[PDB]
Amino acid sequence: KVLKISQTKYEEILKISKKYIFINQVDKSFHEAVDDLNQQDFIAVSGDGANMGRKCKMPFLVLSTDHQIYIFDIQVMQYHAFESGLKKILEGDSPKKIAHDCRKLSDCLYHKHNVKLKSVFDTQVGDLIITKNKKVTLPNKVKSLGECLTNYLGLQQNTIDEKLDIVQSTERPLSVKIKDSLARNIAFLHHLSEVINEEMQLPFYRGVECYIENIRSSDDFKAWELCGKLNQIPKEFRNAID
Amino acid sequence: KVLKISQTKYEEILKISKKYIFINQVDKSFHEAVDDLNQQDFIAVSGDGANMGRKCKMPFLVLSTDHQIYIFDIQVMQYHAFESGLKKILEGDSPKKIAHDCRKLSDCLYHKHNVKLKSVFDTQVGDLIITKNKKVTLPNKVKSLGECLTNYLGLQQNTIDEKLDIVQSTERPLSVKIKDSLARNIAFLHHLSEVINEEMQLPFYRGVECYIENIRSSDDFKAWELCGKLNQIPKEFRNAID
């Protein structure tokens, strides 16, 4: 069962988590960020800031590429940020938004920002599918972002700062501590998505490999036999997909 | 449960099934076909011709793009066809080879043509995964190409010509009837693959949509409640993925 991210990759991501860009005006850097995000097939979006769903506006929005994290100050820009590129990004078929449990976020964006989130790769729904396909029954609990980062990447339990201070989040200037945290909370989302995608698809890829080998690697006798029994699934196959 | 291909698309494919190109010398048209095939992310390869696995050489090999079917006369060209592009195509990470039950084909290509088939999207392994994820238990029988074409596209039962005449297959000139048949047998492989891919992935895509809607479309009261119970899977979710 054991799945741990490489050191090298960890370090790459940790660098990126410190290299965030904070944007609080519709300016040069805002358009550079919107261009950057629009150049990607996949971007990521954090749930941080929409923990109250429709009850409450977002004070910030965190979006990333693979290579660069962006923190948009929504409290300051308000609808002007959405209307200058962010609503299009979020509502569009492309780019896909990677998210972990986007339920509150969908809710918040629609009713408070007039943004109909669409086209999403949801790592929490991913974990559910992987669990359902493995252990046959789907579980009753879902897994937080932190638990997934632990089970899929081997990161320590409390990497995610799950209780951002509601009052400091609305205070300005926004603290470095909050920012560093928002950046850390999003920074692994890409790689997690890419591990979870792989695990969802593995039973298929492994099944195909089992097919490519099943006859080709047998000795002549068993090869012949197996050609007579093609309507059956290979004996190894149940095994290979688990 | 009901899945039927569109008329329009059927007709497009039926046209293509008549527009095949027969290649029996390493010439201009052979290199044009190898370039064509190398330009694609996905090509298809038929099991026709390798029904005896290692016991017997391939008299022809059928490969296609989306837009063009190719029939390579292996009996005539022998190892010269593989060495001038086909072995690279078949052995490579890319393009992916779409196939239906590639077991005998893997076997035949390795032991008789010295070709290590690799990187495959196997529609039969696809059907198994779809069945396993739907009905929890994987079945004991596999489905032929024809049965899949029936269940996924609604094509009639006997579209596939499953018993090509072994003796006429080795006779030259190769009959038009055989050729028309080889082309017909491969012609739907692309679209089948693309329907089967979709069905394998649908439980995920549907799960994500259920998440995007679950809170956002509730009235205020239920919205609030659901924000308290996030550790649980949405009630609709089991439903949505089936």
CSV table of C-alpha atoms in Angstrom, one decimal:
chain,number,residue,atom,x,y,z
A,1,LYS,CA,0.0,0.0,0.0
A,2,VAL,CA,3.0,2.6,0.7
A,3,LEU,CA,3.1,5.9,-1.3
A,4,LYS,CA,5.7,8.7,-0.5
A,5,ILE,CA,6.8,11.6,-2.6
A,6,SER,CA,10.4,12.0,-3.6
A,7,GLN,CA,12.7,14.3,-1.7
A,8,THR,CA,13.7,16.1,-4.8
A,9,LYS,CA,10.1,16.9,-5.6
A,10,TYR,CA,9.1,17.9,-2.2
A,11,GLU,CA,12.0,20.4,-2.2
A,12,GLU,CA,10.9,21.8,-5.7
A,13,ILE,CA,7.4,22.4,-4.2
A,14,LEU,CA,8.6,23.8,-1.0
A,15,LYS,CA,10.5,26.4,-3.0
A,16,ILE,CA,7.4,27.3,-4.9
A,17,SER,CA,5.4,27.6,-1.7
A,18,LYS,CA,7.7,30.6,-0.8
A,19,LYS,CA,7.7,32.2,-4.1
A,20,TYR,CA,4.1,33.3,-4.1
A,21,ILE,CA,2.8,36.6,-5.7
A,22,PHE,CA,0.3,38.7,-3.9
A,23,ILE,CA,-2.0,40.8,-6.0
A,24,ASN,CA,-4.2,43.4,-4.7
A,25,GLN,CA,-4.8,45.7,-7.6
A,26,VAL,CA,-5.9,45.1,-11.1
A,27,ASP,CA,-2.5,46.0,-12.5
A,28,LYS,CA,0.5,44.7,-14.6
A,29,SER,CA,1.1,41.7,-12.3
A,30,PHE,CA,-2.6,40.8,-12.2
A,31,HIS,CA,-2.8,40.5,-16.0
A,32,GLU,CA,0.5,38.6,-16.0
A,33,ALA,CA,-1.1,36.2,-13.6
A,34,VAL,CA,-4.3,35.8,-15.6
A,35,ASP,CA,-2.2,35.2,-18.8
A,36,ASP,CA,-0.1,32.6,-16.9
A,37,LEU,CA,-3.1,30.8,-15.6
A,38,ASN,CA,-4.8,30.8,-19.0
A,39,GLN,CA,-1.8,29.2,-20.6
A,40,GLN,CA,-2.3,26.0,-18.6
A,41,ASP,CA,-4.4,23.0,-19.0
A,42,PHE,CA,-4.7,22.6,-15.2
A,43,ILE,CA,-4.7,25.2,-12.5
A,44,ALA,CA,-5.4,24.8,-8.8
A,45,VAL,CA,-7.7,26.6,-6.6
A,46,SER,CA,-7.8,26.5,-2.8
A,47,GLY,CA,-10.9,26.2,-0.7
A,48,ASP,CA,-9.2,28.8,1.7
A,49,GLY,CA,-11.4,31.9,2.0
A,50,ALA,CA,-14.8,30.2,1.3
A,51,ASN,CA,-15.2,28.3,4.5
A,52,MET,CA,-18.7,29.7,5.1
A,53,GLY,CA,-20.0,29.0,1.7
A,54,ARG,CA,-22.8,31.4,0.7
A,55,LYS,CA,-22.9,33.0,4.2
A,56,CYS,CA,-19.7,35.0,3.5
A,57,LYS,CA,-17.6,36.7,0.9
A,58,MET,CA,-14.1,35.6,0.1
A,59,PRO,CA,-11.4,37.8,1.5
A,60,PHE,CA,-8.8,36.2,-0.8
A,61,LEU,CA,-8.7,33.7,-3.5
A,62,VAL,CA,-5.7,31.5,-4.0
A,63,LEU,CA,-5.0,30.1,-7.6
A,64,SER,CA,-2.0,28.4,-9.0
A,65,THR,CA,0.0,27.0,-11.8
A,66,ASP,CA,2.5,24.3,-11.5
A,67,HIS,CA,5.2,26.7,-11.3
A,68,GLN,CA,3.6,29.8,-9.5
A,69,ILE,CA,1.1,30.5,-6.7
A,70,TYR,CA,-1.0,33.6,-6.8
A,71,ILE,CA,-2.9,35.2,-4.0
A,72,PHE,CA,-5.6,37.6,-5.1
A,73,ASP,CA,-6.9,40.1,-2.6
A,74,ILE,CA,-10.7,39.9,-3.2
A,75,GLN,CA,-11.7,42.0,-0.2
A,76,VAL,CA,-9.8,44.9,-1.8
A,77,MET,CA,-10.5,44.3,-5.5
A,78,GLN,CA,-14.1,42.9,-5.2
A,79,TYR,CA,-16.1,42.3,-8.3
A,80,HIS,CA,-13.4,44.1,-10.4
A,81,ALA,CA,-11.0,41.1,-10.0
A,82,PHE,CA,-13.6,38.6,-11.3
A,83,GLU,CA,-14.7,40.8,-14.1
A,84,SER,CA,-11.0,41.2,-15.3
A,85,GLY,CA,-10.2,37.6,-15.9
A,86,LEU,CA,-11.0,35.5,-12.8
A,87,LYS,CA,-14.7,34.7,-13.5
A,88,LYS,CA,-13.8,33.5,-17.0
A,89,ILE,CA,-11.0,31.3,-15.6
A,90,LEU,CA,-13.3,29.8,-13.0
A,91,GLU,CA,-16.4,29.4,-15.2
A,92,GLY,CA,-14.6,27.9,-18.2
A,93,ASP,CA,-14.4,24.4,-19.7
A,94,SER,CA,-10.7,25.1,-19.7
A,95,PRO,CA,-8.5,25.4,-17.7
A,96,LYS,CA,-9.6,22.5,-15.4
A,97,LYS,CA,-9.5,23.7,-11.8
A,98,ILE,CA,-7.9,21.3,-9.4
A,99,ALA,CA,-9.5,21.5,-6.0
A,100,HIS,CA,-9.9,19.4,-2.8
A,101,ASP,CA,-13.6,19.2,-1.9
A,102,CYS,CA,-14.9,22.1,-3.8
A,103,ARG,CA,-18.4,22.0,-2.3
A,104,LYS,CA,-18.2,25.2,-0.1
A,105,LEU,CA,-16.2,26.9,-2.7
A,106,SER,CA,-18.8,26.3,-5.5
A,107,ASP,CA,-21.4,27.6,-3.1
A,108,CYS,CA,-19.5,30.7,-2.1
A,109,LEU,CA,-18.4,31.8,-5.6
A,110,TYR,CA,-21.9,31.5,-7.0
A,111,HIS,CA,-24.0,33.3,-4.3
A,112,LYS,CA,-21.4,35.9,-3.3
A,113,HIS,CA,-19.3,36.5,-6.3
A,114,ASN,CA,-21.7,35.5,-9.2
A,115,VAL,CA,-19.3,32.8,-10.4
A,116,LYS,CA,-20.5,29.5,-11.7
A,117,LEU,CA,-17.5,27.3,-11.0
A,118,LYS,CA,-17.1,24.6,-13.7
A,119,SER,CA,-14.7,22.0,-15.0
A,120,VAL,CA,-13.0,20.6,-11.9
A,121,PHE,CA,-10.7,17.8,-10.9
A,122,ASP,CA,-11.6,17.3,-7.3
A,123,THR,CA,-9.0,15.3,-5.4
A,124,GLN,CA,-11.5,14.4,-2.7
A,125,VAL,CA,-13.9,12.9,-5.2
A,126,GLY,CA,-10.7,11.2,-6.5
A,127,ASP,CA,-10.0,9.6,-3.2
A,128,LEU,CA,-13.5,8.3,-3.0
A,129,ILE,CA,-13.3,6.7,-6.4
A,130,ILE,CA,-9.9,5.1,-5.6
A,131,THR,CA,-11.3,3.8,-2.3
A,132,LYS,CA,-14.6,2.6,-3.9
A,133,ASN,CA,-12.7,0.7,-6.7
A,134,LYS,CA,-10.2,-0.8,-4.2
A,135,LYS,CA,-12.3,-1.8,-1.2
A,136,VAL,CA,-15.5,-2.4,-3.3
A,137,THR,CA,-17.8,-0.4,-0.8
A,138,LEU,CA,-17.3,3.3,-0.8
A,139,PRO,CA,-16.6,4.6,2.8
A,140,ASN,CA,-18.8,6.9,4.8
A,141,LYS,CA,-16.2,9.5,5.8
A,142,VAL,CA,-14.4,11.6,3.4
A,143,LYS,CA,-10.7,12.6,3.7
A,144,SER,CA,-9.5,16.1,4.3
A,145,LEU,CA,-6.8,17.6,2.1
A,146,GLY,CA,-4.3,17.0,4.9
A,147,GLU,CA,-5.2,13.3,5.2
A,148,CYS,CA,-4.9,12.9,1.5
A,149,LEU,CA,-1.5,14.6,1.5
A,150,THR,CA,-0.5,12.1,4.2
A,151,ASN,CA,-1.9,8.9,2.5
A,152,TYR,CA,-0.9,9.8,-1.1
A,153,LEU,CA,2.4,11.7,-0.6
A,154,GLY,CA,3.5,10.7,3.0
A,155,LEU,CA,3.5,14.3,4.3
A,156,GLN,CA,3.1,14.9,7.9
A,157,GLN,CA,-0.4,15.1,9.4
A,158,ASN,CA,-0.6,18.9,10.2
A,159,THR,CA,1.1,20.4,7.1
A,160,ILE,CA,-2.2,22.0,6.3
A,161,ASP,CA,-3.2,24.9,8.3
A,162,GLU,CA,-6.9,24.1,8.7
A,163,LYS,CA,-8.0,27.0,10.9
A,164,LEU,CA,-7.1,30.3,9.5
A,165,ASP,CA,-7.9,33.2,11.8
A,166,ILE,CA,-11.2,34.6,10.5
A,167,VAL,CA,-10.5,38.1,11.9
A,168,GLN,CA,-6.9,38.4,10.7
A,169,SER,CA,-8.1,37.2,7.3
A,170,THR,CA,-10.2,40.3,7.0
A,171,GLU,CA,-7.5,42.7,8.3
A,172,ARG,CA,-5.2,44.8,6.2
A,173,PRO,CA,-2.3,44.7,5.4
A,174,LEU,CA,-2.7,40.9,5.2
A,175,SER,CA,-0.2,39.3,7.4
A,176,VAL,CA,2.8,37.4,6.0
A,177,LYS,CA,2.0,34.6,8.3
A,178,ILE,CA,-1.5,34.2,6.6
A,179,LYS,CA,0.1,34.5,3.2
A,180,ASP,CA,2.8,32.0,3.8
A,181,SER,CA,0.1,29.7,5.0
A,182,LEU,CA,-2.3,30.2,2.1
A,183,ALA,CA,0.6,29.5,-0.2
A,184,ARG,CA,1.6,26.3,1.7
A,185,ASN,CA,-2.0,25.1,1.7
A,186,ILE,CA,-2.2,25.1,-2.1
A,187,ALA,CA,1.4,24.2,-3.0
A,188,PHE,CA,1.0,20.4,-3.1
A,189,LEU,CA,-2.4,20.4,-4.9
A,190,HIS,CA,-0.9,19.8,-8.4
A,191,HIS,CA,1.2,16.9,-7.4
A,192,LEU,CA,-1.5,15.4,-5.3
A,193,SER,CA,-3.9,15.6,-8.3
A,194,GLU,CA,-1.3,13.9,-10.4
A,195,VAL,CA,-0.8,11.1,-8.0
A,196,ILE,CA,-4.6,10.6,-7.5
A,197,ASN,CA,-5.2,10.6,-11.3
A,198,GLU,CA,-2.6,7.9,-11.6
A,199,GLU,CA,-4.1,5.8,-8.9
A,200,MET,CA,-7.7,6.1,-10.4
A,201,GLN,CA,-6.4,4.9,-13.7
A,202,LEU,CA,-4.0,2.2,-12.6
A,203,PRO,CA,-6.4,-0.7,-12.5
A,204,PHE,CA,-6.9,-0.1,-16.2
A,205,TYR,CA,-3.2,0.4,-17.2
A,206,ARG,CA,-2.3,-2.7,-15.1
A,207,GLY,CA,-5.1,-4.7,-16.7
A,208,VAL,CA,-3.7,-3.9,-20.1
A,209,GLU,CA,-0.2,-4.8,-19.1
A,210,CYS,CA,-1.4,-8.1,-17.8
A,211,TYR,CA,-3.0,-8.7,-21.3
A,212,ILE,CA,0.1,-7.8,-23.2
A,213,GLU,CA,2.1,-10.3,-21.1
A,214,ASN,CA,-0.4,-13.1,-20.5
A,215,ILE,CA,0.3,-15.1,-23.6
A,216,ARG,CA,3.5,-13.5,-24.9
A,217,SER,CA,5.4,-14.5,-21.7
A,218,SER,CA,4.1,-18.1,-21.4
A,219,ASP,CA,6.0,-21.1,-22.6
A,220,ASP,CA,4.6,-22.8,-25.8
A,221,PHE,CA,2.3,-25.2,-24.1
A,222,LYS,CA,0.5,-22.8,-21.9
A,223,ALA,CA,0.4,-20.3,-24.7
A,224,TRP,CA,-1.5,-22.7,-26.8
A,225,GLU,CA,-3.9,-23.6,-24.1
A,226,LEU,CA,-4.6,-19.9,-23.3
A,227,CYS,CA,-5.5,-19.4,-27.0
A,228,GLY,CA,-8.3,-22.0,-26.6
A,229,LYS,CA,-9.7,-20.2,-23.5
A,230,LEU,CA,-9.9,-16.6,-24.7
A,231,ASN,CA,-13.5,-16.0,-23.6
A,232,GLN,CA,-12.1,-16.2,-20.0
A,233,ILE,CA,-10.3,-13.5,-18.1
A,234,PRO,CA,-6.7,-14.3,-17.5
A,235,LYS,CA,-6.1,-16.0,-14.1
A,236,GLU,CA,-3.6,-13.2,-13.1
A,237,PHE,CA,-6.0,-10.4,-14.0
A,238,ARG,CA,-7.9,-10.0,-10.7
A,239,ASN,CA,-4.6,-9.8,-9.0
A,240,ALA,CA,-3.0,-7.4,-11.5
A,241,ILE,CA,-5.7,-4.7,-11.1
A,242,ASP,CA,-5.5,-4.5,-7.2
B,1,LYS,CA,-28.4,1.7,-19.6
B,2,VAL,CA,-29.0,2.4,-23.5
B,3,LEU,CA,-25.9,3.6,-25.6
B,4,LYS,CA,-26.3,4.0,-29.5
B,5,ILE,CA,-23.9,5.9,-31.9
B,6,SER,CA,-25.3,8.7,-33.9
B,7,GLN,CA,-26.3,8.2,-37.5
B,8,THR,CA,-24.1,11.0,-38.7
B,9,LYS,CA,-21.1,9.3,-37.1
B,10,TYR,CA,-21.8,5.9,-38.3
B,11,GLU,CA,-21.9,7.2,-41.9
B,12,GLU,CA,-18.6,9.0,-41.4
B,13,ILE,CA,-17.0,5.7,-40.3
B,14,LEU,CA,-18.7,3.7,-43.0
B,15,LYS,CA,-17.1,6.0,-45.5
B,16,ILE,CA,-13.7,5.5,-44.0
B,17,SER,CA,-14.1,1.7,-44.0
B,18,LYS,CA,-14.3,1.9,-47.8
B,19,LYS,CA,-11.4,4.2,-48.2
B,20,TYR,CA,-8.6,1.9,-47.1
B,21,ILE,CA,-5.1,1.8,-48.5
B,22,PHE,CA,-3.4,-1.4,-49.3
B,23,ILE,CA,0.3,-1.4,-49.1
B,24,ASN,CA,2.4,-4.3,-50.3
B,25,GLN,CA,5.8,-2.7,-50.9
B,26,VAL,CA,8.0,-0.4,-49.0
B,27,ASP,CA,7.3,2.5,-51.3
B,28,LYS,CA,6.0,6.1,-51.3
B,29,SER,CA,2.6,5.2,-50.0
B,30,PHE,CA,4.2,3.1,-47.2
B,31,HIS,CA,6.3,6.0,-45.9
B,32,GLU,CA,3.2,8.3,-46.2
B,33,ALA,CA,1.3,5.8,-44.0
B,34,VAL,CA,4.1,5.6,-41.4
B,35,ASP,CA,4.3,9.4,-41.3
B,36,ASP,CA,0.5,9.6,-40.9
B,37,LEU,CA,0.4,7.0,-38.1
B,38,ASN,CA,3.4,8.8,-36.3
B,39,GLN,CA,1.5,12.1,-36.4
B,40,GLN,CA,-1.2,10.7,-34.0
B,41,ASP,CA,-1.6,10.3,-30.4
B,42,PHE,CA,-3.8,7.2,-30.9
B,43,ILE,CA,-3.7,4.6,-33.6
B,44,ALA,CA,-5.6,1.4,-33.9
B,45,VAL,CA,-4.4,-2.1,-34.6
B,46,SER,CA,-6.6,-5.1,-35.4
B,47,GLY,CA,-6.2,-8.6,-34.1
B,48,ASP,CA,-6.9,-9.9,-37.6
B,49,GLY,CA,-4.0,-11.9,-38.8
B,50,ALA,CA,-2.6,-13.1,-35.5
B,51,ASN,CA,-5.3,-15.5,-34.5
B,52,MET,CA,-2.8,-18.3,-33.9
B,53,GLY,CA,-0.5,-16.3,-31.7
B,54,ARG,CA,3.1,-17.5,-31.8
B,55,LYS,CA,2.1,-20.6,-33.9
B,56,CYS,CA,1.9,-18.5,-37.1
B,57,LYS,CA,3.1,-15.5,-38.9
B,58,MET,CA,0.9,-12.6,-39.8
B,59,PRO,CA,-0.2,-12.5,-43.4
B,60,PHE,CA,-1.4,-8.9,-43.1
B,61,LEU,CA,-1.4,-6.2,-40.4
B,62,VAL,CA,-4.2,-3.7,-40.2
B,63,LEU,CA,-3.4,-0.2,-38.6
B,64,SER,CA,-5.4,2.9,-38.6
B,65,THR,CA,-5.8,6.5,-37.8
B,66,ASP,CA,-9.0,8.2,-37.2
B,67,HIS,CA,-9.2,9.3,-40.7
B,68,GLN,CA,-7.5,6.4,-42.7
B,69,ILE,CA,-7.2,2.6,-42.6
B,70,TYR,CA,-4.0,0.9,-43.7
B,71,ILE,CA,-3.6,-2.7,-44.7
B,72,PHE,CA,0.1,-3.8,-44.8
B,73,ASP,CA,0.9,-6.9,-46.7
B,74,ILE,CA,3.3,-8.7,-44.3
B,75,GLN,CA,3.4,-12.0,-46.2
B,76,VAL,CA,5.0,-10.1,-49.1
B,77,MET,CA,7.1,-7.5,-47.2
B,78,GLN,CA,8.1,-9.6,-44.2
B,79,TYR,CA,10.7,-8.2,-41.8
B,80,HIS,CA,11.4,-5.3,-44.2
B,81,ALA,CA,8.0,-3.7,-43.3
B,82,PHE,CA,8.7,-3.8,-39.5
B,83,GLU,CA,12.2,-2.6,-39.9
B,84,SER,CA,11.0,0.5,-42.0
B,85,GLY,CA,8.7,2.0,-39.4
B,86,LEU,CA,6.2,-0.5,-38.2
B,87,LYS,CA,8.2,-2.1,-35.3
B,88,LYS,CA,9.0,1.4,-34.0
B,89,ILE,CA,5.3,2.3,-34.1
B,90,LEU,CA,4.3,-0.8,-32.3
B,91,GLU,CA,7.0,-0.9,-29.7
B,92,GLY,CA,6.9,2.8,-28.7
B,93,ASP,CA,5.4,4.6,-25.8
B,94,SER,CA,3.7,6.7,-28.3
B,95,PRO,CA,1.5,6.4,-30.3
B,96,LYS,CA,-0.9,4.4,-28.1
B,97,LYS,CA,-2.3,1.4,-29.9
B,98,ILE,CA,-5.9,0.9,-29.6
B,99,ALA,CA,-6.8,-2.8,-29.7
B,100,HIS,CA,-9.5,-5.2,-28.7
B,101,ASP,CA,-8.0,-8.1,-26.7
B,102,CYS,CA,-4.4,-7.8,-27.7
B,103,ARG,CA,-3.3,-11.1,-26.1
B,104,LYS,CA,-2.8,-13.2,-29.3
B,105,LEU,CA,-1.5,-10.2,-31.1
B,106,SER,CA,1.2,-9.5,-28.4
B,107,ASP,CA,2.1,-13.1,-28.6
B,108,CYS,CA,2.3,-13.3,-32.4
B,109,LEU,CA,4.2,-10.0,-32.9
B,110,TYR,CA,6.9,-11.0,-30.3
B,111,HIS,CA,7.7,-14.6,-31.3
B,112,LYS,CA,7.2,-14.3,-35.1
B,113,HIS,CA,8.0,-10.8,-36.0
B,114,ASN,CA,10.3,-9.8,-33.1
B,115,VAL,CA,8.1,-6.9,-32.0
B,116,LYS,CA,7.5,-6.1,-28.4
B,117,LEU,CA,4.1,-4.5,-28.5
B,118,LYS,CA,3.8,-1.7,-25.9
B,119,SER,CA,1.5,1.2,-24.9
B,120,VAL,CA,-2.0,0.0,-25.5
B,121,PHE,CA,-5.6,1.0,-24.8
B,122,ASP,CA,-7.4,-2.3,-24.9
B,123,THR,CA,-11.1,-1.9,-25.2
B,124,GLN,CA,-11.7,-5.4,-23.9
B,125,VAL,CA,-9.8,-4.6,-20.7
B,126,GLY,CA,-11.9,-1.4,-20.8
B,127,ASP,CA,-15.2,-3.3,-20.8
B,128,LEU,CA,-13.9,-5.4,-17.8
B,129,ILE,CA,-13.2,-2.3,-15.8
B,130,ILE,CA,-16.5,-0.6,-16.6
B,131,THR,CA,-18.3,-3.9,-15.7
B,132,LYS,CA,-16.2,-4.4,-12.5
B,133,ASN,CA,-16.9,-0.7,-11.4
B,134,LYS,CA,-20.6,-0.9,-12.2
B,135,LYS,CA,-21.7,-4.4,-11.0
B,136,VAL,CA,-19.0,-4.6,-8.2
B,137,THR,CA,-17.9,-8.2,-9.1
B,138,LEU,CA,-16.0,-8.5,-12.4
B,139,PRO,CA,-17.6,-11.1,-14.7
B,140,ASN,CA,-16.1,-14.4,-15.7
B,141,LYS,CA,-16.6,-14.1,-19.5
B,142,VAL,CA,-15.1,-11.4,-21.6
B,143,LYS,CA,-16.8,-9.7,-24.5
B,144,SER,CA,-15.7,-10.0,-28.1
B,145,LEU,CA,-15.2,-6.9,-30.3
B,146,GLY,CA,-18.5,-7.5,-31.8
B,147,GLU,CA,-20.4,-7.8,-28.5
B,148,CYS,CA,-18.7,-4.5,-27.4
B,149,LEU,CA,-19.7,-2.8,-30.7
B,150,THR,CA,-23.2,-3.9,-29.9
B,151,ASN,CA,-23.3,-2.9,-26.2
B,152,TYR,CA,-21.5,0.4,-26.6
B,153,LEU,CA,-22.5,1.6,-30.0
B,154,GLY,CA,-25.7,-0.4,-30.7
B,155,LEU,CA,-24.3,-2.0,-33.9
B,156,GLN,CA,-25.8,-5.1,-35.1
B,157,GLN,CA,-24.5,-8.5,-33.7
B,158,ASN,CA,-22.5,-9.8,-36.8
B,159,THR,CA,-20.9,-6.6,-38.1
B,160,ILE,CA,-17.5,-8.2,-37.3
B,161,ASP,CA,-16.4,-10.9,-39.6
B,162,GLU,CA,-14.9,-13.2,-37.0
B,163,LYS,CA,-13.8,-16.1,-39.2
B,164,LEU,CA,-11.6,-15.0,-42.0
B,165,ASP,CA,-10.7,-17.8,-44.3
B,166,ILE,CA,-7.3,-18.9,-43.3
B,167,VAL,CA,-6.4,-20.2,-46.8
B,168,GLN,CA,-7.6,-17.2,-48.8
B,169,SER,CA,-5.7,-14.9,-46.3
B,170,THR,CA,-2.4,-16.5,-47.5
B,171,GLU,CA,-3.4,-16.3,-51.2
B,172,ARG,CA,-2.3,-13.6,-53.6
B,173,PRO,CA,-3.5,-11.3,-54.9
B,174,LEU,CA,-5.4,-10.7,-51.7
B,175,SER,CA,-9.1,-10.7,-52.4
B,176,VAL,CA,-11.2,-7.5,-52.2
B,177,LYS,CA,-13.6,-9.3,-50.1
B,178,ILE,CA,-11.0,-10.0,-47.4
B,179,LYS,CA,-9.7,-6.5,-47.7
B,180,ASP,CA,-13.1,-4.9,-47.4
B,181,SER,CA,-13.6,-7.1,-44.3
B,182,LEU,CA,-10.3,-6.3,-42.6
B,183,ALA,CA,-11.1,-2.6,-43.1
B,184,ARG,CA,-14.7,-3.0,-41.7
B,185,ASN,CA,-13.3,-5.0,-38.7
B,186,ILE,CA,-11.0,-2.1,-37.6
B,187,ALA,CA,-13.1,0.9,-38.7
B,188,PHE,CA,-15.1,1.4,-35.4
B,189,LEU,CA,-12.1,0.8,-33.1
B,190,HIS,CA,-11.4,4.5,-32.6
B,191,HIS,CA,-14.9,5.5,-31.7
B,192,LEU,CA,-15.4,2.4,-29.5
B,193,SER,CA,-12.3,3.3,-27.6
B,194,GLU,CA,-13.5,6.8,-27.1
B,195,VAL,CA,-16.9,5.7,-25.8
B,196,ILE,CA,-15.3,3.1,-23.5
B,197,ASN,CA,-12.8,5.7,-22.2
B,198,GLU,CA,-15.7,8.0,-21.4
B,199,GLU,CA,-17.6,5.3,-19.6
B,200,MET,CA,-14.5,4.3,-17.5
B,201,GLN,CA,-14.1,7.9,-16.3
B,202,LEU,CA,-17.7,8.8,-15.9
B,203,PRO,CA,-18.1,7.8,-12.3
B,204,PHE,CA,-15.4,10.4,-11.5
B,205,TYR,CA,-16.7,13.2,-13.7
B,206,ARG,CA,-20.2,12.6,-12.3
B,207,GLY,CA,-18.9,12.6,-8.8
B,208,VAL,CA,-17.3,16.0,-9.3
B,209,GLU,CA,-20.4,17.4,-10.8
B,210,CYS,CA,-22.4,16.2,-7.8
B,211,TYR,CA,-19.9,18.1,-5.5
B,212,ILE,CA,-20.1,21.3,-7.6
B,213,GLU,CA,-23.9,21.2,-7.2
B,214,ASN,CA,-24.5,19.7,-3.8
B,215,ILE,CA,-24.3,22.9,-1.8
B,216,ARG,CA,-24.6,25.6,-4.5
B,217,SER,CA,-28.0,24.4,-5.6
B,218,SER,CA,-29.5,23.9,-2.1
B,219,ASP,CA,-31.7,26.5,-0.5
B,220,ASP,CA,-30.2,28.4,2.4
B,221,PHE,CA,-31.3,26.1,5.2
B,222,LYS,CA,-30.0,22.9,3.7
B,223,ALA,CA,-26.9,24.7,2.5
B,224,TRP,CA,-26.0,25.6,6.1
B,225,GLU,CA,-26.7,22.1,7.4
B,226,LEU,CA,-24.5,20.6,4.7
B,227,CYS,CA,-21.6,22.9,5.7
B,228,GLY,CA,-21.7,21.3,9.2
B,229,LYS,CA,-21.6,17.7,7.8
B,230,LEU,CA,-18.7,18.0,5.3
B,231,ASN,CA,-16.8,14.9,6.6
B,232,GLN,CA,-19.8,12.9,5.1
B,233,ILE,CA,-20.3,12.0,1.4
B,234,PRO,CA,-23.3,13.8,-0.1
B,235,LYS,CA,-26.4,11.7,0.0
B,236,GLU,CA,-26.8,12.0,-3.8
B,237,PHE,CA,-23.3,10.8,-4.5
B,238,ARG,CA,-23.7,7.0,-4.6
B,239,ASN,CA,-26.5,7.6,-7.0
B,240,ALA,CA,-24.6,10.1,-9.2
B,241,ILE,CA,-21.7,7.8,-9.9
B,242,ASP,CA,-23.8,4.8,-11.2
